[PDB]
Amino acid sequence: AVDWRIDNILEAIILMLPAMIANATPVVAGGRRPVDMGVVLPDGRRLLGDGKTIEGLLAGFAAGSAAGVLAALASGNMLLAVHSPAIALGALAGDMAGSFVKRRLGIERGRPAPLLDQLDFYLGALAVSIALGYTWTPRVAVEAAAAVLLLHLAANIT
Amino acid sequence: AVDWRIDNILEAIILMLPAMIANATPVVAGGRRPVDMGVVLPDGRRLLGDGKTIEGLLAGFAAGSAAGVLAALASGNMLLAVHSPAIALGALAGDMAGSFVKRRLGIERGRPAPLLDQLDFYLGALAVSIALGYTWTPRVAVEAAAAVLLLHLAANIT
Ligand SMILES: Nc1ccn([C@@H]2O[C@H](COP(=O)(O)OP(=O)(O)OP(=O)(O)O)[C@@H](O)[C@H]2O)c(=O)n1
Ligand SMILES: Nc1ccn([C@@H]2O[C@H](COP(=O)(O)OP(=O)(O)OP(=O)(O)O)[C@@H](O)[C@H]2O)c(=O)n1
Ligand SMILES: [K+]
Ligand SMILES: [K+]
Ligand SMILES: [Mg+2]
Ligand SMILES: [Mg+2]
Ligand SMILES: [Mg+2]
Ligand SMILES: [Mg+2]
Ligand SMILES: [Mg+2]
Ligand SMILES: [Mg+2]
Helix, strand or coil, rough: CCCCEEHHHHHHHHHHHHHHHHHHHHHHHCCCCCCCCCEEECCCECCCCCCCHHHHHHHHHHHHHHHHHHHHHHHHCCCCHHHHHHHHHHHHHHHHHHHHHHHHHHCCCCCCCEHHHHHHHHHHHHHHHHCCCEECCCHHHHHHHHHHHHHHHHHCCC | CCEEEEEEEHHHHHHHHHHHHHHCCCHCCCCCCCCCCCCCCCCCCCCCCCCCHHHHHHHHHHHHHHHHHHHHHHHHCCCCHHHHHHCCCCHHHHHHHHHHHHHHHHCCCCCCCEHHHHHHHHHHHHHHHHHHHCCCCCCHHHHHHHHHHHHHHHCCCC
């Protein structure tokens, strides 16, 4: 069950799974057309870099929308099918905002920014869910962030 | 005033100011003897790197202890003079743990790891305060973290 007060970790995980899926899909869908059209800024660095492709955004968005159907059916909350596309967009925007910040700091495309690399999409998606009218408790907002960390390190321990 | 339930941002700021001061002091005190004795690990990277010096740790510890005297006098809570050295140590340990993680990821000494570079000392200090018996609310734990970010970006906007 998902209501407007996100106050347990399973409910956060249901709400956020479209974002997680939107964030993870571009690594398999590939892509080769950069969102930033290859633009370099006056600091010598790409605006976003090659890691952000238009095929990535579309597959991520498509995947997040499809997952929100599953979130809506699993939870009985049909609003999840309407909200999950917007949340997917926030996840995708936050991942790009993180790449933007890495480039401005001189961090080359692909080099690790620990914490930021794992949480940027979560923070964009979280921001959108709040713009949509959801209230998070701070504890469950922290737990979900740590659950994102645990699964990323869970993805790499396998 | 500082009690055992850290539940407002000013009380968190008083408790944490020794850690902030412990974390900031090594950048001026210099230092040239690495904590890691120059050891390189089998992955080819330094254990900690040159950025962690023994003079840094001592000046940081000294500074954090001195600040806890000010925290104890400002708040009327004499236990702050006893706790602030341990909290300073947690701040120093967390900053080293962050450098450790950067080296294992191939991030060279001094290259930016945004978020991690600003929060590692806060997380060590927070861990020690909880080991000491303090309870944080999640909201004030998040606020203080964002206040650390805001001041670091405040340090750089001046
Ligand atoms: N909008 C996106 C997001 C990611 N990806 C693909 O997924 C990979 C991994 O994503 P990410 O780790 O975020 O990109 P990085 O290669 O690490 O680049 P950056 O340093 O900007 O994070 C990218 O290389 C890219 O192949 C994509 O095509 N389009
Ligand atoms: N225990 C410490 C902590 C820091 N410093 C000094 O303060 C500077 C800045 O601290 P920090 O940013 O944490 O070190 P970095 O140079 O960025 O190295 P790292 O990549 O490991 O973070 C260091 O270069 C070093 O001169 C020190 O001497 N001893
Ligand atoms: K990323
Ligand atoms: K640091
Ligand atoms: Mg609820
Ligand atoms: Mg670049
Ligand atoms: Mg990456
Ligand atoms: Mg209190
Ligand atoms: Mg090294
Ligand atoms: Mg640094």
